[PDB]
Amino acid sequence: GMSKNERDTSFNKNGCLVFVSRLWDLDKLGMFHHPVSAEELPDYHTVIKRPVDLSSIRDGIEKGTYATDVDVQNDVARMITNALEYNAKGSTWYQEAMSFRKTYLDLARQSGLVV
Ligand code: NA
Ligand code: NA
Numbered sequence: 751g752m753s754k755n756e757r758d759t760s761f762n763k764n765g766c767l768v769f770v771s772r773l774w775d776l777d778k779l780g781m782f783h784h785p786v787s788a789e790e791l792p793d794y795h796t797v798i799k800r801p802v803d804l805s806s807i808r809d810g811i812e813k814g815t816y817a818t819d820v821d822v823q824n825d826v827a828r829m830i831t832n833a834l835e836y837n838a839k840g841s842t843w844y845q846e847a848m849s850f851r852k853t854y855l856d857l858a859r860q861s862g863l864v865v
Pocket of ligand 2: 761
């Protein structure tokens with residue numbers, strides 16, 4: 751039968767890793783791959799108090815710090831919203847974030863997550 755971790759389907763570790771891998775590959779610019787560095791954008795954290803990125807999300811999935819698949823999706827939603835709050839409509843970064851907002855739930859679904 752199922753392991754205790756398998757049988758608790760609130761969080762599905764491997765499905766969540768698939769999801770992050772899909773986002774990683776969708777990210778042509780690599781803009782969401784790693785945390786925003788204050789050295790690169792020193793006015794960013796005045797705006798964004800809850801930064802998050804795909805590497806940090808993957809780490810949390812691996813370490814088992816997410817309670818549910820939806821919590822993983824919440825961090826992706828916030829990642830995207832952060833970009834649309836900080837950036838100026840029309841910029842390369844804004845355009846990529848818009849594309850992510852329209853696509854991420856479909857990728858979560860394809861990857862086997864509860865949506
Ligand atoms: Na089994
Ligand atoms: Na599980």
